[PDB]
PDB file of C-alpha atoms in Angstrom:
ATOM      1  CA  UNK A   1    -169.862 156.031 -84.233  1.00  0.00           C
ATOM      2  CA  UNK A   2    -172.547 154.339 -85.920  1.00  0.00           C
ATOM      3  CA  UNK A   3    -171.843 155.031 -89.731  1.00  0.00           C
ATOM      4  CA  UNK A   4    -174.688 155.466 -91.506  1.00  0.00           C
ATOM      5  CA  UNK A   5    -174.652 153.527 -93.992  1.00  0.00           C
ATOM      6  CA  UNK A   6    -175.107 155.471 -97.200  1.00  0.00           C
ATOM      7  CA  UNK A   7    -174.054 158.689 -95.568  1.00  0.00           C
ATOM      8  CA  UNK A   8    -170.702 159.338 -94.352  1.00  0.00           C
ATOM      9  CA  UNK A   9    -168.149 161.059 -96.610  1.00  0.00           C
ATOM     10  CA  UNK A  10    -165.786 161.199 -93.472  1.00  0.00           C
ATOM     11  CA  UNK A  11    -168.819 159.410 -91.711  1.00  0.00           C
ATOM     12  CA  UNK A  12    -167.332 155.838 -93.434  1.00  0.00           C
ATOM     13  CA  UNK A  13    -165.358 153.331 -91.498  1.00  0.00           C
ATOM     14  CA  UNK A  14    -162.125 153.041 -92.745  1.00  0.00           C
ATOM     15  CA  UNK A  15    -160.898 149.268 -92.039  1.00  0.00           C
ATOM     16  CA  UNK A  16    -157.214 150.299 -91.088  1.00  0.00           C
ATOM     17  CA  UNK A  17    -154.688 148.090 -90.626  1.00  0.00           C
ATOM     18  CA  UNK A  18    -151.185 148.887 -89.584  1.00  0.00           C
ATOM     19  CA  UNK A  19    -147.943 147.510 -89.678  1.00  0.00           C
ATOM     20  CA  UNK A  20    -145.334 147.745 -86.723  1.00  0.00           C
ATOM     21  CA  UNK A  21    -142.188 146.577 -87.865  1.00  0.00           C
ATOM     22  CA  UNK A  22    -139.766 145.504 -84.900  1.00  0.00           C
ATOM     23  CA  UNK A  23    -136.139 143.691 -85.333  1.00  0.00           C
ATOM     24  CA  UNK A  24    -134.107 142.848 -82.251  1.00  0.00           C
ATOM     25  CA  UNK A  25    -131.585 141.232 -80.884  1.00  0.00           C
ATOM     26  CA  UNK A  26    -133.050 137.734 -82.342  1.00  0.00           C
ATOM     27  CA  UNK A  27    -133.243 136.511 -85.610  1.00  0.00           C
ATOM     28  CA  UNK A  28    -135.665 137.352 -88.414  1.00  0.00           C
ATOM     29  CA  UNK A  29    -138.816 135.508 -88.233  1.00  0.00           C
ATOM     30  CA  UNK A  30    -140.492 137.262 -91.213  1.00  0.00           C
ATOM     31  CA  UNK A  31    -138.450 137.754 -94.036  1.00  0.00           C
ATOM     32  CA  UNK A  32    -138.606 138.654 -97.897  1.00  0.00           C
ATOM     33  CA  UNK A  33    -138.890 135.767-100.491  1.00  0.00           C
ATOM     34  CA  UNK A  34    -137.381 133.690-102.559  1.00  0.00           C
ATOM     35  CA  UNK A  35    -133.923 133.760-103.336  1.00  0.00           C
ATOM     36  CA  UNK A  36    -131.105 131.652-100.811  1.00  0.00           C
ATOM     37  CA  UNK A  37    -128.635 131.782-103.631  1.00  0.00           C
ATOM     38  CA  UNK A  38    -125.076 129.429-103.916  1.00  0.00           C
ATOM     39  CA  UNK A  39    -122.880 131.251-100.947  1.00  0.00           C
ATOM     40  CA  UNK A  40    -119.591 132.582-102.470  1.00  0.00           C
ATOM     41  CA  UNK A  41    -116.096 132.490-100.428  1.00  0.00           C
ATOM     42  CA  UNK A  42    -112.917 134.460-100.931  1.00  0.00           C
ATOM     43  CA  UNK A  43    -114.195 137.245-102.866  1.00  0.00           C
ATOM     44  CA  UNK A  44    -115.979 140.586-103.094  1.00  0.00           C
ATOM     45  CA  UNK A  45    -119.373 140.697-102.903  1.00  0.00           C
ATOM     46  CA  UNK A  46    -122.793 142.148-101.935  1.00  0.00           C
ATOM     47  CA  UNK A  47    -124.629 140.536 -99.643  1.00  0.00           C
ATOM     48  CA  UNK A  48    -127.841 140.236 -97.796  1.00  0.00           C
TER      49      UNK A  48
ATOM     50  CA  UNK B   1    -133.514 137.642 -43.486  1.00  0.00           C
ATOM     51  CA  UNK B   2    -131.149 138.849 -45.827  1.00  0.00           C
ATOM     52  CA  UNK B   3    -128.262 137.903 -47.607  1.00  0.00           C
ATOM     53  CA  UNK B   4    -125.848 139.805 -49.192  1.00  0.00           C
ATOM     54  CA  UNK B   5    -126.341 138.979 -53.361  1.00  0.00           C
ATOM     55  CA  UNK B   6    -122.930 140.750 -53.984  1.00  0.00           C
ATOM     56  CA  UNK B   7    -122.299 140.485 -58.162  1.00  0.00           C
ATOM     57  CA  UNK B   8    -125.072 138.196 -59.162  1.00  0.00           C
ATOM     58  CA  UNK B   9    -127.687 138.807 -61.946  1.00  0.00           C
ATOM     59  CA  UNK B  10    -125.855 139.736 -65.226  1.00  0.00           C
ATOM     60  CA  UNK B  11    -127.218 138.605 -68.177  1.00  0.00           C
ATOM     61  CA  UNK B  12    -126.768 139.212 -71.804  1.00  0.00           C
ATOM     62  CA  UNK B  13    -128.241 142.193 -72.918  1.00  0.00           C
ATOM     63  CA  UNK B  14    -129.023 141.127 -76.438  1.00  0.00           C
ATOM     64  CA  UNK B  15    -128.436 138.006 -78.919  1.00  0.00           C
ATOM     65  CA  UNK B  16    -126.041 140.178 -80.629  1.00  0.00           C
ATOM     66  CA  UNK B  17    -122.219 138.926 -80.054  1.00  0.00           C
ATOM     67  CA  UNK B  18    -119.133 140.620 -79.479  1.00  0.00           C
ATOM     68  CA  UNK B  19    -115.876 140.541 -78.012  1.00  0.00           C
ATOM     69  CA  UNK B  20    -113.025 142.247 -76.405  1.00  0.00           C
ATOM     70  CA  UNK B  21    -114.956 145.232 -75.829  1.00  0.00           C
ATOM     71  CA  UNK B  22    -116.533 146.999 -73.376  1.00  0.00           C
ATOM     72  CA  UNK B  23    -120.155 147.899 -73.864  1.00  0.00           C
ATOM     73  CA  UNK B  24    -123.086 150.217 -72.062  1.00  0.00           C
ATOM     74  CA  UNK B  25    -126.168 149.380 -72.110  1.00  0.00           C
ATOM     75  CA  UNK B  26    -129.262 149.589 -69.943  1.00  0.00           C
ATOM     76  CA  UNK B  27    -131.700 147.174 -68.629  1.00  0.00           C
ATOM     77  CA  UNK B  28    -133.101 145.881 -65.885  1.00  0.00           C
ATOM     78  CA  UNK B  29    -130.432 144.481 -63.839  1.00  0.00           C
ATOM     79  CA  UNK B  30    -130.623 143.555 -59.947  1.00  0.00           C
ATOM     80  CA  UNK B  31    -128.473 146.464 -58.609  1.00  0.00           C
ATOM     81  CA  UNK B  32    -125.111 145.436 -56.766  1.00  0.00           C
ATOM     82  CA  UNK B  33    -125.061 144.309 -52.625  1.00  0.00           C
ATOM     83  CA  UNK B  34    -128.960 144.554 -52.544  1.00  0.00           C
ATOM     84  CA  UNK B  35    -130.511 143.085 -50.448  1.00  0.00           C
ATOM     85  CA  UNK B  36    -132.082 139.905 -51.492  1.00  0.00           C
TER      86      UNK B  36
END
């Protein structure tokens, strides 16, 4: 490519990263934070 | 030589669990009486 450096309008390098999400058959490695609250019995709730 | 590998070579599929129930899935499985 070479960019030059002052130059490109479409000409820039754009660092991109990207983000493949997989989930299988196994158990979550990477997960959201913060929150293992008191587990509830015996009655309706949401859960995650 | 060759022996006949009549049922062998079933695994589980996936982690997930389940019971009393008949599932279809594919994989990669060795087929049945091959050749081994």
């Amino acid at each position: 490519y070479g960019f030059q450096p002052t130059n490109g309008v479409g000409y820039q390098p754009y660092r991109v990263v990207v983000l493949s999400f997989e989930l299988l058959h196994a158990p979550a490695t990477v997960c959201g934070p913060k929150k293992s609250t008191n587990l509830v019995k015996n009655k309706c709730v949401n859960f995650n | 030589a060759y022996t006949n590998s009549f049922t062998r070579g079933v695994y589980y599929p996936d982690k997930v669990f389940r019971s009393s129930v008949l599932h279809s899935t594919q994989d990669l499985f060795l087929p049945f009486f091959s050749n081994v």
